[PDB]
Every structure is written in structure tokens, then in C-alpha cells.
């Protein structure tokens, strides 16, 4: 099935329970049986219309004998309608097959801009490159003062302004928004 | 994005990333290829007489007809990159051949001179002049080629 | 420098061409600017420096010919635009409001009829952001917007 399978609008059997938007995503943060994908640069909610347009715009410019695309986010289940929570760093749609990144860059960027939250078209190589250069940034920054250091040491009494979650987010994640430039 | 507390904004500004600054700008600081190599090396011994022209102003059909009239004889027409032909001259020890091949160049490798009839054919098209060649390690200009033909 | 002369018969003669001055302070550099130690030490008004990269009618010379860096070619081009608009090259012309440090071509900017509020003021650009890394001889940074 080298195509994005149709997803149900709502689950047949509702589930009781098991902010899912703020902070980095913990699951589906790494490629699994794919080579390209769409990465969420910020949290948000995916609607059924959003999913349907993902599937449409991916399966339109699709080569089933050379491209296979899979979801990484489940069907809309959270009641509000039904939506899916997505956190920053979460892959949305993965692709694989005998293909090159520029072959998909165009419409992947288009569909990422379509997405309600900030999103990016990321290959395995680009994901590794951005992770490595983020590590390089945090290792070579010439600023003696970092959000992590100041918040942990409660310098200037700054925890009176900050949140308890800021100690773990180290200033990179502020609410649902994610700031990759923030070292 | 909702407005942060001003103290938090000051914290973010002070903790903004500072890239390392190099003192001196690094910028302002200091198998088809081998197939062509071997084929041209073999051709340099296969051919006995060689000539070059500028067969680029011709149309597709005119070039096809010229190729047919050349294949009527045992002569074979060749095109090869100057980018790779320049090393070939020094590899085959052809020093006088350096100021001969630049831009478009079409070789006319042969062993039996039908250059009389080839010049006769070229005459009816008053362009595409003959360019100097080098038969059996002996350079011949256009006048030398004409004398050899006669 | 080759020049074409007509009489019709036309021919090109190579004439006298100036050479780089002897003893560069920093030989073996990328650009002439790096060779002569001028990375951040020239401005729009340094006509003696700027005119050395200028066609006789005022146009810039190509980067390939000049040997300048990409960034230095951009800086020289913008500085030459500013010098021309300030009237510092009266002889390098194709054939009355005094200005200087003009970033934009005078006929292409629109009047600021509604300058915004204090927190969103529409400022008038001055100079070029390309020269932001120049040598700073002042306590306060020189402002690019007024």
C-alpha cells in the first residue's frame, strides 16, 4: 500500500482518557522506515480537513511504484469535532522509496505552509544536519549567559517571572511555540 | 505570540546566541572520463592522418549528409571535449597542437587521404575552412594539406 | 585597456594601463581590499578608492575583472551609488538638491505621509546596511535609519 491510507473522521469506539501541545514531542521524533518527512516546528491541532488535505496533496503528486507515504499522527480523536494534538519536533507525514529529496521538496514545503502550525520539509540528512548544528550552536556560543544557567541558578530572581516548565524547556519552548534559533 | 513579561524579554535578549567570530575572514584568507582517456589514447595510434574543422555552423541534415559523404571513405569524424583534449596533447607529446584546438573542434581521423574530394565538397559551401592538422607526428598547415592533396 | 577607433574601418588598440602600486601591505590576499588592508576602512566619500573600480561613464566594473570579494564588490557598488547621488563623481557621467548617504534612487521612494506611532515609526533609511561592519570611531553606533 504505497499511499497515504484514508483515516476515519472519528473513532468507532470513543476512549475515555489515556496540554498535549506545549513542549517538545517525545514520540515519532525520528525517522522510521522512511527517508523524507514533514516536521512540526511548533505545537498545534490537526483537524480532519487538515488530514484530508494532507492525504490529497500527497497522493496527487505521488508515484506508487517509486514513493510510499505513511502517517505518523493518529486519527482525530480528541473531542472539542475531533482533532489530533501535535507537539514541536513531531513528524507528520513520512515518505520513502527510490527518490531524492528535491523530488519532493516543492510540494512538501507547500503542504507544510498549509499546515496550521509552523512546519518544515525535512529529509533524514537535513534532520541530522539541523540537530548537529544545534549542538554546535549550544557548544560554541560565546554568550557566557544562557537561559538554562540563569533559570537553574535563579539568577536575578528570574524564576519569579519564569514558569516551572521553563527550567526543563531551557527557554527554547515557550507555550506551544518553539524557537529553534533560541540556543 | 502573546506579549512576554518585560523581565522575561530582557532575559531572552541577554541569553540570545552569540556566534563565534573568527579574527580574519576565511574567504579573504588563503567512468566516462577514463573511457574518453583510453579511447583517445587508442585513437591517437589508430589514426595515421588527422585534421580538424569547425563543423558547428551546419544544420542537422547538412551534418548528416557530410557524415555520409565521409563514411563513403574510410575517414571517420570525431568530436571530443577540449577540456579533456588539452591534457591529451601533452600526454601524446603534441606541443605544436596546443594553439589549434579551442572552442568547437571536429577531428577527421583517417588512413587513406580523400582530402582532394573532401576539399572539393567543401568548396561548394564557401565556409567551414580547413584547420591545420598533424599527420604521423608531422604538423601540416592548410597549405601543407593542400600540397599533400595535390 | 583596449579602445576601438573608427575611420568605414574600425580597429582596437591596447593603450597604457595602470598597474597595482608597489609593495602591497598584505601580499597574497583574496581581494585587492584584503591585499591593501582596507576591509572596513572606506566609505561612500572615498572617491580615490571607489573610482578605481568604475567605468569611465560611472558604471561599476565586474567582480571577475576587479578581483574583489563578493561582499567587497557589493560594498563598492553601493558606495559608488551613494557617491554618484552625492555628486562626488562629476566627471564619470554618461555624457538641485544636495544629498549624501542616499540608499535609494531618488525617484523610487514615496513620501512618508503617515509615520507610525512611537513603537512602530516608519524611519527614513540613511546610508547602507552593507557598511554596518565598518570601523566604529564613535561611542554610539552609527544609525542606518533616521
Amino acid at each position: 500500500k504505497p499511499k497515504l491510507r484514508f483515516i476515519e473522521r472519528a473513532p468507532l469506539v470513543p476512549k475515555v482518557r489515556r496540554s498535549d501541545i506545549r513542549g517538545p514531542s517525545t514520540e515519532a521524533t525520528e525517522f522510521t522506515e522512511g527517508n523524507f518527512a514533514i516536521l512540526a516546528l511548533g505545537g498545534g491541532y490537526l483537524h480532519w480537513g487538515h488530514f484530508e488535505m494532507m492525504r490529497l496533496t500527497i497522493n496527487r503528486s505521488m508515484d506508487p511504484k517509486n514513493m510510499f507515504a505513511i502517517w505518523r499522527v493518529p486519527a482525530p480523536f480528541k473531542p472539542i469535532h475531533y482533532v489530533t494534538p501535535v507537539k514541536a519536533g513531531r513528524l507528520v507525514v513520512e515518505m520513502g522509496g527510490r527518490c531524492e529529496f528535491e523530488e519532493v521538496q516543492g510540494f512538501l514545503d507547500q503542504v507544510a505552509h498549509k499546515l496550521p502550525f509552523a512546519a518544515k520539509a525535512v529529509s533524514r540528512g537535513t534532520l541530522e544536519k539541523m540537530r548537529k548544528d544545534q549542538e554546535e550552536r549550544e557548544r560554541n556560543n560565546q554568550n557566557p549567559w544562557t537561559f538554562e544557567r540563569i533559570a537553574t541558578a535563579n539568577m536575578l530572581g528570574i524564576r519569579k517571572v519564569l514558569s516551572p516548565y521553563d527550567l526543563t524547556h531551557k527557554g527554547k519552548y515557550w507555550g506551544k511555540f518553539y524557537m529553534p534559533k533560541r540556543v | 505570540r502573546r506579549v512576554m513579561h518585560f523581565q522575561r524579554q530582557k532575559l531572552m535578549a541577554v541569553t540570545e546566541y552569540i556566534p563565534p567570530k573568527p579574527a580574519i575572514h576565511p574567504s579573504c584568507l588563503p567512468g566516462l572520463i577514463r573511457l574518453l582517456r583510453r579511447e583517445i589514447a587508442a585513437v591517437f595510434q589508430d589514426n595515421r592522418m588527422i585534421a580538424v574543422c569547425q563543423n558547428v555552423a551546419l544544420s542537422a541534415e547538412d551534418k548528416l549528409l557530410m557524415r555520409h559523404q565521409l563514411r563513403k571513405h574510410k575517414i571517420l569524424m570525431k568530436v571530443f571535449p577540449n577540456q579533456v583534449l588539452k591534457p591529451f596533447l601533452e600526454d601524446s607529446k603534441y606541443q605544436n597542437l596546443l594553439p589549434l584546438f579551442v572552442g568547437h573542434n571536429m577531428l577527421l581521423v583517417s588512413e587513406e587521404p580523400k582530402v582532394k574530394e573532401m576539399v572539393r565538397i567543401l568548396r561548394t559551401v564557401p565556409f567551414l575552412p580547413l584547420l591545420g592538422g598533424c599527420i604521423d607526428d608531422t604538423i601540416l598547415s592548410r597549405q601543407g594539406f593542400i600540397n599533400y592533396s595535390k | 585597456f583596449r579602445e576601438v577607433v573608427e575611420t568605414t574601418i574600425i580597429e582596437g588598440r591596447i593603450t597604457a594601463t595602470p598597474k597595482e602600486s608597489p609593495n602591497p601591505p598584505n601580499p597574497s590576499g583574496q581581494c585587492p581590499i584584503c591585499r591593501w588592508n582596507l576591509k572596513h576602512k572606506y566609505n561612500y566619500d572615498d572617491v580615490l578608492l571607489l573610482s578605481q573600480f568604475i567605468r569611465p561613464h560611472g558604471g561599476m566594473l565586474p567582480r571577475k575583472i576587479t578581483g574583489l570579494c563578493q561582499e567587497e564588490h557589493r560594498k563598492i557598488e553601493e558606495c559608488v551609488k551613494m557617491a554618484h547621488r552625492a555628486g562626488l563623481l562629476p566627471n564619470h557621467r554618461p555624457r538641485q538638491l544636495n544629498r549624501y548617504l542616499t540608499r535609494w534612487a531618488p525617484g523610487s521612494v514615496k513620501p512618508i505621509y503617515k509615520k507610525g506611532p512611537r513603537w512602530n515609526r516608519v524611519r527614513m533609511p540613511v546610508g547602507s546596511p552593507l557598511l554596518r561592519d565598518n570601523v566604529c570611531y564613535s561611542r554610539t553606533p552609527w544609525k542606518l535609519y533616521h
Binding site: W145, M155, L156 | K10, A13, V14 | P117, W119
Partner: peptide, 29 residues
């Protein structure tokens, strides 16, 4: 209305942070 951080404000905060870092050092022994 939005507010912005000036170089003077950043320098003041940095001065305070330096004092606090020295406090850390002198409290470490």
C-alpha cells in the same frame, strides 16, 4: 503597546548577572 530591550538594559542585566556569578563563587567555599 509593545516594549523593546535596549543595549543599556542588556548591559545592566549583564552587570547584575556578573555580580551574581561572583556571589556563587564566594558562596562555593
Amino acid at each position: 503597546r509593545p516594549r523593546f530591550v535596549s543595549l543599556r538594559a542588556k548591559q545592566n542585566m549583564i552587570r547584575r548577572l556578573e555580580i551574581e556569578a561572583e556571589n556563587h563563587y564566594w558562596l562555593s567555599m
